[PDB]
Structures are given as C-alpha cells and as structure tokens.
RNA sequence: CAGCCUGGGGCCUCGUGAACGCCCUGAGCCGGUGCACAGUCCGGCAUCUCCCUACACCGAGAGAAGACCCCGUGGAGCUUCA
RNA sequence: CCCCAUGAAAAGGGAGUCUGGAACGAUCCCGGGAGACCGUACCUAGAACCGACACUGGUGCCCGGGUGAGAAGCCCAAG
RNA sequence: GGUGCAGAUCCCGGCGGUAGUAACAGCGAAGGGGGGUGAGAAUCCCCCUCGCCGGAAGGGCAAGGGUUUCCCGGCAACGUUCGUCAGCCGGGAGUUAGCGUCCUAAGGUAGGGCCUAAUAGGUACCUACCGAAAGGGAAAGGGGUUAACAUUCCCCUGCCU
RNA sequence: CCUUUCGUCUUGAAACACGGGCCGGGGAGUUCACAUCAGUGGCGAGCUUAAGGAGAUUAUCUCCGAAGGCAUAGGGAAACCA
RNA sequence: ACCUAUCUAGCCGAACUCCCCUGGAACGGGGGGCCAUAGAGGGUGAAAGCCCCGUAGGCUAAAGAUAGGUGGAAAGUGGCUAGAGGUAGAGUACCAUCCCCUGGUUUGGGGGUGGGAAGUUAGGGGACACGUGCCUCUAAGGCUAAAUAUGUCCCGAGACCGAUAGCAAACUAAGUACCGUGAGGGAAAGCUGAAAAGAACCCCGGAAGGGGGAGUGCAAAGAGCCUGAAACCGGGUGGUUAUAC
RNA sequence: AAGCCUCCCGGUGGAUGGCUCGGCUCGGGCACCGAAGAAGGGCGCGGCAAGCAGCGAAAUGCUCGGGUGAGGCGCAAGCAGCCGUUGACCCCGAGGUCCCCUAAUGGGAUAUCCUGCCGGGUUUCCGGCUCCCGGUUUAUAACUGGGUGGGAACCCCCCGAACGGAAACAUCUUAGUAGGGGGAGGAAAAGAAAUCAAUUGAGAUCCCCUGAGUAGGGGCGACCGAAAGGGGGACAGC
C-alpha cells in the first residue's frame, strides 16, 4: 500500500474535512482506511523459537 | 515430489492440455472384458458401449455417442431429459460411475495401445 | 483572464507529441527532445532511481 | 485536414475502432449484455493521440 | 412622497429534478437558575390538529481550525554596525 | 513626404562575357512518351476546439438596397 | 494472535430529511392553423402563414477533435421536457491531383575539437543537417456528373518539366 | 411517581465549547534489541552453548561442538597491593 | 567420432462400486470384504484408502543440451654440493604544506601542490620523535578455483487473507479507463444449479429474462440469478390519537 | 384525519456466513540477452474477429523427425464449413519465415516515416555504407577483417545532499546513506603480505560467530567506532 504519493490537503480547506491523506483526488495511505498499509503488519523479523 | 497444496492441483484439472485429456475419461471395464484382455482400466473411445452404477438412472446400457474431452464427461443414447419444447437433450453422466461393456476392434492404432500394457499374448 | 479564458487559447498543438519510442504523446517538439522516451540527448534509455515511490 | 500522416497514416489502435461488439459473438457467449468497456466518444473524451 | 402601467421572474398546472444547516423532533412565551443570555431544569402563562403563501425577528441560523492579540526554546522572508 | 526606425536572407530563374570541344542542330514549331510519395471527409463554434457539459468565457481570420458620412442605429434583400 | 469501537470535522458503501422544494426566467426570437406518421405528439414530419437575425445566427477558409460525413433501422439510457427525432445507439459505405514534399530567419541539433572525473554537462571554432500547411518557391480552368468528396473522375480548351 | 444530551477538553466548565443525519463493513500501544525486575522452571561454583558439523523418515529431530559471555574479589592512574 | 551418466516427454503402477436403510444423487447410517513400501493430495451429483487421477516405488528416447571417460598435438626439460660473480620495478618511496575522509589520536589511508631518494653492500615495518641494538617482510605490474550478494524466474512448504483484506491487480483490459501540456497519480468490479433443464406452449401489451397461467428441476430469491441485516419505504396484523410532552 | 410503536409480508440495497484457477511470505533450484539486429514500443493477421493472448504479409500457424493417441478448429455455447485413421489437434526438439521504429548505423525526421550510392543477379528483390583496431592501393580515396544498449535486485568505482539529533545551534553526528555519472557479470569485488605479534610464533583472500560498544575518537554532546586472537565454513596458487 505504500506505493503512493498521497498527502493531506492541508487545513482550512474544510472541504478537506479531516487531515486524512488523499492522492490528488482520492484518500489512501492511512492506517485506518481502505487498502493502505496495516497498523502493525507481521514480519519475519519477529521471534519464533522458545 | 509434486506439490500438495489444493490450489495448484485444481489448476491442472481446470487447464488440462490437450494430449492429456484421456486422463478424465478412463473408466472401469468389466470382468469379462479383462478376462480376454488382461487389463483393468482404459481410456474411453467412441463407438463403444457402457453400463452405469450410480445416479437416478442406474443400470443402463447404451452406446458411446457423445463426449466432453476438454473437461471429461460422456453421454450415451437412449437416455434423455425432454426440454420444454419437446426435443431431447443427452443426459450427461461421468465415466466415474460407469463400466464399459465392449470396444471397437477396427482401428489398429487403438489396438497396440491395448497391447503395450503387458497383457499376455493377444 | 486568470480564470477560464486562461484555458481558452489552449487549442494549439500539444507541446508534447507522440515520441516514436515509448508510445507516450510526450515529445517536446519545442525543446527538440522527449521528456518521456529519452530520445533526443541520451543514447541510453531515460531511467531513474525513482520511477515510483520505493 | 492537413494532418501530417503521423496520426492518420497510422490506423487502428491509433485513429480507429471505438467499435461496437460483434453481433454473432454475443450469441456465442450468451452473455447478458455484451460490451467493449473501452468504449469512448469524441464529445466526452480526449484521445491521447 | 408617493402613485399607475408593461416584459420576465415570482402565482398556479404538466414533465424533469438537487444541495445547506440535522446529538435530537421533544423546541410556544415570560421571569429565574446555572459557564454569569435555555428546548428540555424551576415557577407560572397559555397552548386542538392539518394545509398554503409572505416575512427573514429568533433559532446566541448556516458559510469558513478568526484575517486581529499572544504562546510554541515552530517555520519562511527581508535588512544591518547580530 | 517622413526616419538618431532605412525597413531578411536562401534556394530557384534568366541573361551577359571568355575558354575548350565536336559538327550537327536548336530556348522554333510539328508528331510522340512520361511525370514519384503523401495532405485531401466534416466543423468552425450560442451544440462539432478548449474551459469537467449540447457552457452568454476565450481562440481566429476574410467578404447587398434604401435610409443614411458611414462596417453607427432601423428595416428589408441573399441565406 | 492484524483480536472485542459511537465517535477520530475517520474511511468506504447504502439511504435519510429539508422534498417533487430550487431551478428548467433574466444576455431583446415566436409561433399559429390544417393534414401525416406512428402505441404514444406543444416538442417529429407535410402545407400555408407569421416573426426574428441579416458587417452576422450569412458565406468560405485553419490548428483540433477523428468519423463529429452520408445511407438504412431503432429508442433503456444518453438530450436539461418529451420524443417516432438527433452530432445517440445499432447495420453498411465514403476522400484520388504532372498544375507538403524544396530552401531559408529567428535559431536549434549532431559530430570533430576546448573544458567537465564522468557524464543524458557547457561548448566561443569548424563541419553536416533540422527548422514556415499565412516567408519564397514550374506550370488549369471551365463547365458537367454521385447521398456522400472533387481545380483530382467524364468533355474541351490548355499549360509546365 | 422521579428523571438537563453523547464523548472529550476542562477548577467547574457541557447546556451559548468543540466533534457529533442514519445504517452496515473496515479501523489504532504492536516488533526487535538491550538494560532492569517479577513470576516460573532446569542446573549449580559454576552456568551457558552460539556460530557451526555429522546422522536422520530432513527445516521437526539426536549427538557433537565452551567459541565466547556472566559470575567466581576489590581498591586505585599506575607501578602494585590485595 | 564412440561409450556412460544427467536434463528436455510421456509411461507402469493394489485393493469393493458387496448387502440393507435414508437420500434427487451416496462420497451418508448399519452390516459385510480387501490392498497397503502407495491412507500427500485432487476429482467424481455430499464427508469415498479399496469409483477415477495421482501418490511410494519404478520405467521411457529418435533429436538435442550438459558432465565424465575414451583422443591428438606443441613447448620446456638432469638432481645435489662448495666457492666466485651478477640480477632483483622512480618523480616511485619519502619529506613540507593544503584538503578529504576514516577511531587513527603530536601516530591512518587518499589526493593537490613543492621538493625529493636509496635501490642487494637496497629498503620498509615493529603506536611522539631520535639513536642503539633484536624480530619479520621485499611494493611502486600482473592474473586466480572455491567458500557469499539477490529474486526478473522456476519447483516445494506454510500457526499468511478470503473479495472494502490479501501486493493495485482473483473479473472480458488491468498500470487498463481515466485526471493532468508534464514529469506523474491512479481506479471499480468474484458465486445460476451437477447437468441451461434458460420457462415450450396459451392470454395482455409494441417491446422489454415484462405481466399472468402452465412446465423443468431437491429447491427456484430463474439472468438484477447462494445465503440475503439495517438504515428505507409500502400493504397488513395488534393496540392507539385532534386539551394537549 | 397524521399516525405512533411493535410486529408479519414485500420490495431497495448486498454485510454476515460460507466457496476460491489470486496474491503473500519463506526456504531450495536456477540464474545474462544483445549489429546474425535486443529489450521496449507501433502497426497488421482468422469466414463471419473488438480486447487479450498468440502470431509477422510464410499473420490463429509452415516443414521435419520424437512421444501421444480419437477427435480438433483459444479465451468463448452462434451460422456455415473444413482438417482427422494416408495419423490429426496437442507436447518436445530441430528448423523456415520473422513488417516498422527502436542503442537503429546509407542520409534525413516535431513522419513508428520518406529518401539516396554502390555491387549482385535481376520480374519480384538481395548485400554493404558515428568511434575505433589491425591490412589492400598514392604518400588522405575507397576498399579487407572484429568496442555501443537493456536486464528485479544484487556488484564495483568516482560525485555528492538536506530532514532531524544535540530538547536551542554553529563543531560534530545523522552520512558516504538518499541521489547523480560510468561499467560489468551471474555473481561481482579481492586474492598471494614491505601481513601481523612479541620470546621469537602464526602464515592468501572472503564471509559467518565471538572478540566488543573493548581499543580509540568528539561543544568529551548526542553519538561514532576497530584491529589482533579464538571458533566455523571451503581451505586450491601458478
């Protein structure tokens, strides 16, 4: 999901309701919304053995 | 050595290349067939006849008249379900639930395939 | 004017046209160069370390 | 039109065929309503040369 | 110091057909209380329901992280004898 | 007439002069032969281009009578 | 263990109310009658009349769009209404030149060389070339013919190399 | 009969502060490494094997491998003492 | 050339469709019988070791490719001991200065700038400099097997997700439609049942997988096709209203 | 009369639940293509043919062997017709064709297009034409014969950032990373000591674990940060 240049529209736009980040027309990249990168994605670097 | 993931396996049977289609046709012969042929299973060909063991129409004997090689199922005459109009359409029954009863000895190229399976002399 | 009429005069030729190499209508005739297919001043193909986000 | 045969000289995927689906093919597919999604139009579009 | 008339809107009728304010639908008014100006709380006054039009008085109406003042060991810019 | 502004260059043509060449020989007329390749539809804008639209915005360019100086206004020709 | 949600002016999808409300006025156009088609007609067609434009709503010409042109058949949307109709959809057809290509200014490039560590960098010098559909630049018009384009096809007169 | 609307910021401020149309789906203290503690177990003046090798039904597994690190004495700069 | 092996290919490969019941279908329940070096797994009208494939194990080459052997040729050709003699890489080391970096610090390496050696009886190095002894190496030219860096790709496995997640991508085309003059940004969208058996046929309308009736089929939620919640709206059921939250 | 509330039913949306020819991680194999014309694009090509995929005017496939063995004519069910037992379709290998641009190189390009000069046979057409190395022929004329670009990451080498951190900030650090340029291969690099260490010892290089945040550096600030030795792997040296 990181393959984006998405960004906030800044503030005082109002039309940009929230500092949600959007790419030149549509929102992405945020942990909370559609398709973007996970909150805390599991990786192979995590320990496994006891 | 071939994998055992379900996904890959299903890909072969949904994508069966042409020269391997006999695989989903071979059905069990009868005892009398193997009695003079010394062979258990073999691929179906046209011009043959079969008997059925499963399905609502169990116990039928017909003739090998229709086939679906690419996906692997056949049909036999004298067994149809009438459409709304009244013309018959062929009942589709899989080789998996059939037993062959006789074959065609008029090819000389299907014959040697029979021979090479270590069946005894002739 | 800065509003719509600024878009008015915009019927003339595209300042970037079909460059023969990369199939992108991005050949700046005016600069004698394509900014997309690289044809014009690099013998090599234009390629960068940042074609995308990494 | 003095188009300098770089766009009309090329014909096909360039300067051709925003075409309707073939008829008999639709019969074959038995599909509900067959389309080419690539459908475009001069008034609403800007062909990228 | 106002008045009359005309065209198009505005009125009505057929067809098409949106967006704004929405914790709510429970909000009438008046004193009072309380963040020191209530729709619900307190005490009175009233208050039948439904519909259409005109008014924007109120809804501390909506529009927009106030354009002002200050803070952040926050930016950018300009200047010089930092 | 004006200028402390003096108002583009090639290819392409034509002619003039001198050298060499062969004697046949046309920038004349008459008859004959040929002459790549590619542009070529439509619209030019109150619906055909752009401005997200079948958008009073812009982008153009050029061109009847009378009344009337008039391409002003009016009306009416062509459409 | 990606782990229990009402919010984060959250994201995304669906649907509310204001609601058949606003608007479908405003920039000087306007239609009416009779007939036809078709299920269905203010809106489409036929006739007549009438009003308006009329240095532009007319006429011819670009860059651009790319079939928007024409024929035949259609209307679920698409058209600010409707719609038998259309630049819309569906089935077919349609541009011809002995009467741009050449050269060149602003300039530009590509190479040889002068630097740059290198370069897809700069380059005063030299060389080669690109650079105008309104610059210059050989030579035709007339009539006539298809629904569709024409100085190009048919005829005569030509004309230039 | 008794009953100020959710959450949050906040001395109280929530009710004239903010964010709040409805419904559904998504959605936020995780990973590693070090340090230190607790709890738990194995062994014990030791502990501990890593990296790594061999065999194996082959990443599981068994054996081997102290390599090393911590503790096992501190003081001071040292010479050293201990 | 030949031989051997390996890779490109396909091939062999066990055991029940036995009985009763349910079930549209048995791949279910009960009973009965069997292979197994093969009970990974997949398919077939459901949950099948023995219905089908595959599996453990084994087999395949014309023709190619890879590896090895089998082949041929050329060049240079004593060993030790003692003595004598000779060779052994320059702007290179090294030094001063400026700069760069690395822990390299009065101590490292590199470069610019200026100087600048010895060179076999040579030199360097052995944490500031110098000297002395002791120890070990020989640059200013080459060249080099393996032991490791990675997934454009191909096999295999998985305490990775089930269609707003999973990489953007599971779909008729995905960097596709598209927004941008431009570098660029960047989508949405899976399920008919097993077999279309896709409702023949009759009535309405012009038509619409539209109405109705019939029919297929276990089932039609039969094309907009699995299941089918709410926000919503409509009909109905049950209460219930115009002096009132 | 509105309704109000709840509930039954229907439609409007499709979450849930289920299913998956998809991706994702891992490990292991494998691991250069290119002027004999790449990769990358642009065009065409089937009976009725749009996209994909495949294909190159020899366009849904051409030939020859090998296997295969009765249907085939893709995605994808229609009309019509054909190929197939004289061995199809398919798969393997070998060939043949293989348009245009493209590093594109006859010359030119704001044309995926136009356009020369030689030599060849000759109807169609075929071969050659920047910067170099070495030869023919005069000592400058042409002629004989062989370095360019791409490739997911990885590798090598030059050039070379700010953001932040120090709660400010300028030395320092973030850091030779981001990035630029060149150049390769399937691995690259490096590789035989002017090496160490120190009681007279070891014996190329590389990577792995330790040594070790030790040594040592710095407004002594954040921080940076070895070597030697030991233990492993293969250990080749001309």
UniProtKB/Swiss-Prot annotation, chain A:
Organism superkingdom: Archaea
Role noted for this protein: One of the primary rRNA binding proteins, this protein initially binds near the 5'-end of the 23S rRNA. It is important during the early stages of 50S assembly. It makes multiple contacts with different domains of the 23S rRNA in the assembled 50S subunit and ribosome.
Assembly and interaction partners: Part of the 50S ribosomal subunit.
Family from the record: Belongs to the universal ribosomal protein uL4 family.
Protein name: Large ribosomal subunit protein uL4
Lineage: Archaea, Thermoproteota, Thermoprotei, Sulfolobales, Sulfolobaceae
Gene designation: rpl4
Full protein: residues contained: 60 to 109 of 266
UniProtKB/Swiss-Prot annotation, chain B:
One GO cellular component term noted in the UniProt record for this chain: large ribosomal subunit
Transmembrane segments: none
UniProt-listed GO biological process terms: translation
Keyword Cytoplasm set for record: no
SMART domains the UniProt entry points to: KOW (SM00739)
Cited InterPro entries: KOW, Rib_uL2_dom2, Ribosomal_uL24_euk/arc, Ribosomal_uL24_KOW, Translation_prot_SH3-like_sf
Keywords: Ribonucleoprotein, Ribosomal protein, RNA-binding, rRNA-binding
Ribonucleoprotein keyword on record: yes
Molecular function terms from GO: rRNA binding; structural constituent of ribosome
CDD domains found in the cross-reference section: KOW_RPL26
Lineage top rank: taxon: Archaea
Assembly and oligomerization: Part of the 50S ribosomal subunit.
Primary role: One of two assembly initiator proteins, it binds directly to the 5'-end of the 23S rRNA, where it nucleates assembly of the 50S subunit.
Membership in a protein family: Belongs to the universal ribosomal protein uL24 family.
PANTHER family xrefs: 60S RIBOSOMAL PROTEIN L26 FAMILY MEMBER
Entry-linked NCBIfam families: rplX_A_E (TIGR01080)
Name under which the protein is recorded: Large ribosomal subunit protein uL24
Lineage, top ranks: Archaea, Thermoproteota, Thermoprotei, Sulfolobales, Sulfolobaceae
Swiss-Prot record, chain C:
Function: Binds to the 23S rRNA.
GO biological process, one term: translation
A Pfam family per the record: Ribosomal_L37e
Official protein name in the record: Large ribosomal subunit protein eL37
UniProt similarity note: Belongs to the eukaryotic ribosomal protein eL37 family.
Transmembrane segments: none
Annotated zinc fingers (C4-type), start-end: 19-37
Protein keywords: Metal-binding, Ribonucleoprotein, Ribosomal protein, RNA-binding, rRNA-binding, Zinc, Zinc-finger
Presence of the UniProt keyword Ribosomal protein in the record: yes
Binding positions for Zn(2+) per the UniProt entry: 19, 22, 34, 37
GO cellular component: a single term: cytosolic large ribosomal subunit
Cofactors (names): Zn(2+)
Cofactor comment text: Binds 1 zinc ion per subunit.
Any GO MF annotation of the entry: rRNA binding
Keyword Metal-binding: yes
Swiss-Prot record, chain D:
HAMAP family: Ribosomal_eL39
Classification lineage: Archaea, Thermoproteota, Thermoprotei, Sulfolobales, Sulfolobaceae
NCBIfam families reported for this sequence: PRK01242.1
Organism: Sulfolobus acidocaldarius (strain ATCC 33909 / DSM 639 / JCM 8929 / NBRC 15157 / NCIMB 11770)
Gene field: rpl39e
InterPro entries associated with the record: Ribosomal_eL39 (IPR000077), Ribosomal_eL39_CS (IPR020083), Ribosomal_eL39_dom_sf (IPR023626)
Coiled coil region boundaries: none
UniProt keyword Ribosomal protein present: yes
Keywords associated with the record: Ribonucleoprotein, Ribosomal protein
A Gene Ontology cellular-component term: cytosolic large ribosomal subunit
SUPFAM superfamilies: Ribosomal protein L39e
Gene Ontology annotations of biological process type: translation
Name of the protein: Large ribosomal subunit protein eL39
Family membership noted in the UniProt record: Belongs to the eukaryotic ribosomal protein eL39 family.
Record keyword Ribonucleoprotein present: yes
GO molecular function: structural constituent of ribosome
Described function: Binds specifically to a region in 26S rRNA near the subunit interface.
